[PDB]
Amino acid sequence: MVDWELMKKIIESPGVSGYEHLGIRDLVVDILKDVADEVKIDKLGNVIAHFKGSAPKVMVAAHMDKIGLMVNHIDKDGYLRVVPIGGVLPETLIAQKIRFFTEKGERYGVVGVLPPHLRIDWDSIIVDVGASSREEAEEMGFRIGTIGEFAPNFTRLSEHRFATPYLDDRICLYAMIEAARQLGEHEADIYIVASVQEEIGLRGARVASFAIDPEVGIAMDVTFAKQPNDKGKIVPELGKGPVMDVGPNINPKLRQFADEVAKKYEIPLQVEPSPRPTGTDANVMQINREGVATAVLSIPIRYMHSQVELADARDVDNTIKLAKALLEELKPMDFTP
Amino acid sequence: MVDWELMKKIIESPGVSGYEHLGIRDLVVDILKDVADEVKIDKLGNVIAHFKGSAPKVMVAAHMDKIGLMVNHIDKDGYLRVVPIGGVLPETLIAQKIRFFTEKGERYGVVGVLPPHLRIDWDSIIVDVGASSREEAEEMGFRIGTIGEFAPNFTRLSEHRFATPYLDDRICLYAMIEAARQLGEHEADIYIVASVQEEIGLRGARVASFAIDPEVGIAMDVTFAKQPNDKGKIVPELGKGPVMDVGPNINPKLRQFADEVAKKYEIPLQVEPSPRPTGTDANVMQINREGVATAVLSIPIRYMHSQVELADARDVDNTIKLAKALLEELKPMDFTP
Amino acid sequence: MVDWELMKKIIESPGVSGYEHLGIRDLVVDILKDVADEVKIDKLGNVIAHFKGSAPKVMVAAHMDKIGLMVNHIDKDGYLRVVPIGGVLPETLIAQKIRFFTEKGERYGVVGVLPPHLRIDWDSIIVDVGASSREEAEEMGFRIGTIGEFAPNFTRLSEHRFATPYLDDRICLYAMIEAARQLGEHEADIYIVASVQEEIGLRGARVASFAIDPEVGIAMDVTFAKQPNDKGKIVPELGKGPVMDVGPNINPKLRQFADEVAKKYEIPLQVEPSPRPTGTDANVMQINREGVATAVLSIPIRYMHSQVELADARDVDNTIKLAKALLEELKPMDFTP
Ligand SMILES: [Cl-]
Ligand SMILES: [Cl-]
Ligand SMILES: [Cl-]
Ligand SMILES: [Co+2]
Ligand SMILES: [Co+2]
Ligand SMILES: [Co+2]
Ligand SMILES: [Gd]
Ligand SMILES: [Gd]
Ligand SMILES: [Gd]
Ligand SMILES: [Gd]
Ligand SMILES: [Gd]
Ligand SMILES: [Gd]
Ligand SMILES: [Gd]
Ligand SMILES: [Gd]
Ligand SMILES: [Gd]
Ligand SMILES: [Gd]
Ligand SMILES: [Gd]
Ligand SMILES: [Zn+2]
Ligand SMILES: [Zn+2]
Ligand SMILES: [Zn+2]
């Protein structure tokens, strides 16, 4: 079962990389304070929630930062110029609405388009916030350094599928949190991390990893799903279950284990071939300290890093189940390759 | 004064070129039936509302059709392919939501984007409606020929400025209708037309023009407003008043008259230099039958033909006033150049 | 006040990345041994100077390595081929003098130009050291691995502005050093680090960060200043004060504090929008161990990484004042974002 209302709330709560404290951080803390033995916030802004247990020591990470924008200029006529935080594609900004977090509250701006008869790149991205002068714009609360996000826009397309900005990674943050709320008996000593600044170099998990010092590390990010024009170069598909990579970033014995957990609980599990260190928190967890046994558990989505990221609710539900089952079944074990 | 609620309603009511009967037509008829002597709908779908009077015979036209999309393909996996109705730019479709009018009601779809590592044109525009098969998509109500529009999204940015799809031409349809509701005493014999199929060749006004046979014809469309990257090649500016073109499509004595009406009522009036026959209903009105004395009265907007068209409410209000004043002050006159 | 003689000396002292021991290290050790409680040199060459105090533990880093050149070949005719250590532009080498540190003392070389009628790249970079044969060059003290720098050339242009190779980062090393010298009572437990190998991966601040384990970290590097042909994309300006970034790498609470310090001491303070993890020592400090509260304090300069790096003495003076003031005002406080 999926809680649509809570999911929507977690997806749309403010928090670009480096600015997770604008909303999502407190929302996450307020949900986990009730179920975790202890909840802390570190100097980088990570939310670390301890679910006390015996062994092994297990870290789970789902990043709460969104890709977004920073204002770096305001011109005489009151237009804004912006620059990306994280892998924003400028092509997805044309004729779109941007949600800004100014000092007088949330405001909106609009990225225009040039009518054909007066005619891809970041210098063409000029934000219109409804002002006539630099002074009016400043008075609205706009500053050099003001942060913006894709305007919220949640759409259920069918019974199962839905499109919204920022499924990466709010969809896995939601699944991770949900699995934690339902967490039953477990031998493992579990740390649930809502990591910070993942979209700009995995920095949150790097630092939380150092603090916690786990034996097992599991990252919950989204992954690419088969979509139009992918040239058939994408293995996972929407609606066919959660995904767990295989490859160098993936500890073989941990990956084997998760497979059998899935078999026992009869949860469909997809394979994603990953020949490189992943672009997830598992990358830096694996090379933390003396080494960590790591894996990636992901929800497949279409249209990664756009206002229109699309998932299947059956994959979300199954991801919650497998996350829960894994955390409960995890026991001391030989992870040596 | 501007009625934000009514404006929003008129802007968002369904009606692409050739399909104004999906909503906007009845909305317009229902508003004008109360104030007009007689309201008719012609074979092309035009709404013609007569406000009886003496002379001259005056036609006013604001088009109620929107640019939009038609589905022309549904593939095995349930994706849609679409083609434009009117001057839709494909660049404005990336990561956008489309509102569809299917046979089982309104549904939504989403135009994806291709993640960078697997890489402007219409064959790249594939619509995702949350289906898995052609059959599921058909069952949803999708057909070859299903119509779609930009998803509604009204945003007031500041006290005066607001951005939304389809200000062209719902913003002038609203101003025109509003002026008609407030219409006082007038010597002129007035026909208020909500024209059809303007974005694909001015066809509605061509035909309504023939039926009515006016001596004076006035078109209310939107026009380009000064915006970023316009190379300073746009004269009108947001917030500096309604616009009335000057040029070959504009009868000199009618244009003179409107100028003095504006002076008397002290409504700011901008000039737009138009050396060609205009891309408005005034084009075909002027060459109707034995000739018609024509002018263009427009509201300036930024970002023409995108989801993010932007206007200034002060221009809207002033447009209502000048439209009203002109209709009341209009009297028999020598229009001979 | 700025000490021109001391500033010049610190700027022109030898020390390319990995070879900071050729001069700058001892000059730094010699100056701070007089004011610091303790001075150590680590395995990579960082100079770490302890200024005892209570809390918080504060690391300040100004890098003492310069970008430079390494000889990787000597041909039969005694010419050298070189390769860059750090972000050297080959364009800045045409018709320039190079200072080399040979086994027989400092020597000079020249990178030529080809007269046009005989006609951008590293293969066009051939150094002429005045030799006729490989042996003569060898006998002169030149080896594969010989290190070279931009020849020193300090010039005061006006009362406040001056241009020289290697303001990056000797100008902030100088500022940090002066601030330490003038340091009064302070609650913070202060470590002044003159770091090693910054222009090639922030190595050194990475290791010093680890040994010191601070709670607060401040980098003093140079930053870009508004200059000709910058497309107006550079916010900070010469003469308008020190600069402090805002963005993910900058702890919001520390940044707010520093702002407050500036206001109280009436020191002009600029903002630089930095949406990425910075290209300064603060990048690795932030992700050191369990995380650090970090900021960047920088001097604005023109023509970064060239022989004519150019600064304003008023910004230097103010950077010292702000550096001093910050270190004295710093106290325990909650840095949680
Ligand atoms: Cl990721
Ligand atoms: Cl038009
Ligand atoms: Cl640097
Ligand atoms: Co991402
Ligand atoms: Co149009
Ligand atoms: Co540098
Ligand atoms: Gd550019
Ligand atoms: Gd104010
Ligand atoms: Gd079963
Ligand atoms: Gd250890
Ligand atoms: Gd094509
Ligand atoms: Gd059916
Ligand atoms: Gd007046
Ligand atoms: Gd006639
Ligand atoms: Gd080469
Ligand atoms: Gd002086
Ligand atoms: Gd520690
Ligand atoms: Zn992610
Ligand atoms: Zn139009
Ligand atoms: Zn530097």
Residue numbers in the entry:
A (entry chain C), B (entry chain C), C (entry chain A): 1 to 119, 129 to 346
Sentences from the paper on this structure:
TETs are dodecameric particles of 500 kDa and they were first discovered in archaea and then identified in bacteria and eukaryotes. TET1 is a glutamyl-aminopeptidase, TET2 has a broad specificity against neutral amino acids and TET3 shows a preference for positively charged residues such as lysine and arginine. TETs monomers are all formed by a proteolytic domain and a PDZ-like oligomerization domain.
PfTET3Gd crystal was collected at Gd LIII absorption edge. The asymmetric unit contains three monomers forming one apex of the PfTET3 tetrahedron. By applying the crystal symmetry operators, PfTET3 dodecamer is reconstituted. M1 is coordinated by residues His314, Asp177, Glu208 and two water molecules, while M2 is coordinated by Asp177, Asp230, His63 and a chloride ion. By looking to the preferred coordination number of Co2+ and Zn2+, it appears that Co2+ adopts preferentially an octahedral geometry (coordination number of 6), while Zn2+ is often found in a tetrahedral coordination (coordination number 4).
